[PDB]
């Protein structure tokens, strides 16, 4: 004779289904993250992989039109495991490239202060 | 402002010269007559050792304010010592972002060589199959 | 009997001229200024964080220090009486 | 130094004026290194979606070659 156990189990089962959907929604969206710019995507192209990430950014954000919403968790896990295999010597090549990317700008800082 | 023995506002404050603390004369006097000691530290103290609170001597003072030069100098320590910790919040958070950027750009540099080979292999399979 | 401090202090008082401070932050001008802007932002942040602490900090202490000043004042006027009483006695003695 | 004292007033003014900008410049750089890091994460996850379609075009090719 169960009583408030089926309600606890239904809440536990509904809790489990929410844990499966949030994790398998998206790797980049769940982890962490701008104005809409079709002219910036048009100017950057004027090369194909750069245009693919630009349309991916405009889709997730939704002069801005939305459309792309069909591009599930198992295919992303195998995609993440495969790319991890491709990536001491590997640690130094990532530290050197991070220093290169770390290495016009003054107007943005002044406006950031004007907000402050 | 308070007497440490009773907890009242003492109407005749006398400061001891063994445990530096402002006691009420009438209260501390009875504590000394009970036993020659200071109530807090239990060090020896007599009634002559106790000293009333006095005006310094001949130099005139003014109350503790923000203008006063020494209070203004201790203020500028608070300013800089707080701003020095503000720099740590950005130095420590920079060492996490650049460390995640270094591993991110390495995974980008390790992956984009595999995008270049699949674009070769899938087009080579289309170049091979279509010709046959 | 002091170091360099005494030379410039006595010269400042004799000449009757106070050393000029940073008359810069208040005026400034729109359109080097990328730095001046970023200095302003940080300054404001400090003030605001500091100001916020000060109101609450100030509110907590806005009157706790005023109580200390009343304990400091009454002690002086007790000594005014103790001095008043001795001297009066002396005068009376002389008169007699 | 022997340095005039009215000048030491303007030094302390300049040194606080400099440290205020040396603290400001170090914070906007932290925000933009994190901002440019976030642009790499979108391209990282967008690229591994583009590899899945390229693997399908290779899988479709391996089936046609067998026939």
Curated annotation (Swiss-Prot), chain A:
Residues 1-103 are annotated as: Interaction with DAPK3. Signal peptide: none annotated. Transmembrane segments: none annotated. Phosphorylated on serine and threonine residues. Has no effect on subcellular location nor on homodimerization. Phosphorylated in vitro by CDK2. Phosphorylation enhances interaction with PPP1R8. It comes from the Eukaryota. Ubiquitously expressed in both fetal and adult tissues. It is found in: Nucleus; Nucleus speckle; Cytoplasm. Homodimer. Interacts with DAPK3. Component of the precatalytic, catalytic and postcatalytic spliceosome complexes. Part of a spliceosomal 'core' complex consisting of CDC5L, PLRG1, SPF27, CCAP1, CCAP3 and CCAP6. Interacts with PLRG1, Lodestar/TTF2, and NIPP1/PPP1R8. Component of the minor spliceosome, which splices U12-type introns. Within this complex, interacts with SCNM1. Component of the PRP19-CDC5L splicing complex composed of a core complex comprising a homotetramer of PRPF19, CDC5L, PLRG1 and BCAS2, and at least three less stably associated proteins CTNNBL1, CWC15 and HSPA8. Belongs to the CEF1 family. It is linked to A chromosomal aberration involving CDC5L is found in multicystic renal dysplasia. Translocation t(6;19)(p21;q13.1) with USF2. This is Cell division cycle 5-like protein. The gene is CDC5L. The chain holds residues 503 to 702 of 802 of the full protein.
From Swiss-Prot, chain B:
Ubiquitous. Weakly expressed in senescent cells of different tissue origins. Highly expressed in tumor cell lines. Homotetramer. Component of activated, catalytic and post-catalytic spliceosomes. Component of the Prp19 complex/PRP19C/Nineteen complex/NTC and related complexes described as PRP19-CDC5L splicing complex and PSO4 complex. A homotetramer of PRPF19, CDC5L, PLRG1 and BCAS2 constitute the core of those complexes. The interaction with CDC5L, PLRG1 and BCAS2 is direct within this core complex. At least three less stably associated proteins CTNNBL1, CWC15 and HSPA8 are found in the Prp19 complex. Belongs to the WD repeat PRP19 family. Residues 1-71 form the U-box domain. Induction: By gamma irradiation and chemical mutagens but not by UV irradiation. The chain holds residues 3 to 134 of 504 of the full protein. The 7 WD repeats are necessary and sufficient to support interaction with the RPA complex. The modification N6-acetyllysine is found at residue 120. This is Pre-mRNA-processing factor 19. It is found in: Nucleus; Nucleus, Nucleoplasm; Cytoplasm, Cytoskeleton, Spindle; Cytoplasm. It comes from the Eukaryota.
UniProtKB/Swiss-Prot annotation, chain C:
This is Pre-mRNA-splicing factor SPF27. It is found in: Nucleus; Nucleus, Nucleolus. The keyword GTP-binding does not apply. The chain holds residues 63 to 169 of 225 of the full protein. Component of the pre-catalytic and catalytic spliceosome complexes. Component of the postcatalytic spliceosome P complex. Component of the PRP19-CDC5L splicing complex composed of a core complex comprising a homotetramer of PRPF19, CDC5L, PLRG1 and BCAS2, and at least three less stably associated proteins CTNNBL1, CWC15 and HSPA8. Interacts directly in the complex with PRPF19, CDC5L and PLRG1. GO terms for cellular component: catalytic step 2 spliceosome; centrosome; nuclear speck; nucleolus; nucleoplasm; nucleus; Prp19 complex; spliceosomal complex. GO terms for biological process: alternative mRNA splicing, via spliceosome; mRNA splicing, via spliceosome; oocyte development; ovarian follicle development; protein catabolic process; RNA splicing; RNA splicing, via transesterification reactions; spindle assembly. Ubiquitously expressed. Changing residue 66 to S: In a colorectal cancer sample; somatic mutation. It comes from Homo sapiens. Belongs to the SPF27 family. Keywords: Acetylation, Coiled coil, mRNA processing, mRNA splicing, Nucleus, Phosphoprotein, Spliceosome. Its main location: nucleus.
From Swiss-Prot, chain D:
Ubiquitous. Weakly expressed in senescent cells of different tissue origins. Highly expressed in tumor cell lines. It is found in: Nucleus; Nucleus, Nucleoplasm; Cytoplasm, Cytoskeleton, Spindle; Cytoplasm. Induction: By gamma irradiation and chemical mutagens but not by UV irradiation. The modification N6-acetyllysine is found at residue 56. Homotetramer. Component of activated, catalytic and post-catalytic spliceosomes. Component of the Prp19 complex/PRP19C/Nineteen complex/NTC and related complexes described as PRP19-CDC5L splicing complex and PSO4 complex. A homotetramer of PRPF19, CDC5L, PLRG1 and BCAS2 constitute the core of those complexes. The interaction with CDC5L, PLRG1 and BCAS2 is direct within this core complex. At least three less stably associated proteins CTNNBL1, CWC15 and HSPA8 are found in the Prp19 complex. The 7 WD repeats are necessary and sufficient to support interaction with the RPA complex. Belongs to the WD repeat PRP19 family. This is Pre-mRNA-processing factor 19. It comes from Homo sapiens. The gene is PRPF19. The chain holds residues 67 to 133 of 504 of the full protein.
């Amino acid at each position: 004779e169960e009583r408030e156990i089926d309600d606890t189990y239904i809440e536990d089962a509904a809790d489990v289904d929410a844990r499966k959907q949030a994790i398998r929604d998206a790797e980049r969206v769940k982890e962490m993250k701008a104005v809409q710019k079709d002219l910036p995507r048009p100017s950057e192209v004027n090369l194909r992989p750069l245009n693919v990430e630009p349309p991916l950014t405009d889709l997730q954000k939704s002069t801005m039109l939305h459309y792309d919403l069909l591009h599930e968790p198992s295919g992303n896990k195998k995609g993440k495991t495969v790319g991890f295999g491709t990536n001491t010597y590997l640690e130094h090549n990532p530290y050197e490239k991070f220093s290169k990317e770390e290495l016009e700008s003054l107007e943005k800082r002044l406006e950031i202060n004007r907000g402050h | 402002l308070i007497c440490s023995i009773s907890n009242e506002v003492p109407e005749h404050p006398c400061v001891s010269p063994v445990s530096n603390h402002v006691y009420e004369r009438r209260l501390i006097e009875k504590y000394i007559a009970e036993n020659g000691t200071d109530p807090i530290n239990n060090q020896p103290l007599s009634e002559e050792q106790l000293i009333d609170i006095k005006v310094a001597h001949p130099i005139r003072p003014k109350p503790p304010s923000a203008t006063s030069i020494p209070a203004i100098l201790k203020a500028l320590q608070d300013e800089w010592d707080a701003v020095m910790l503000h720099s740590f919040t950005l130095r420590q958070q920079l060492q996490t972002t650049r460390q995640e950027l270094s591993h991110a750009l390495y995974q980008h540099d390790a992956a984009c060589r595999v995008i270049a080979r699949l674009t070769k292999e899938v087009t080579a399979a289309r170049e091979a199959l279509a010709t046959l | 009997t002091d170091i360099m401090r005494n030379e410039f202090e006595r010269l400042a008082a004799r000449q009757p001229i106070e050393l000029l401070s940073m008359k810069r932050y208040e005026l400034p001008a729109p359109s080097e200024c990328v730095n001046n802007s970023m200095a302003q932002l940080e300054h404001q942040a400090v003030r605001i964080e500091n100001l916020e602490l000060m109101s609450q900090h100030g509110c907590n202490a806005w009157k706790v220090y005023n109580e200390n000043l009343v304990h400091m004042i009454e002690h002086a006027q007790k000594e005014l009486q103790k001095l008043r009483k001795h001297i009066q006695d002396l005068n009376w003695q002389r008169k007699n």
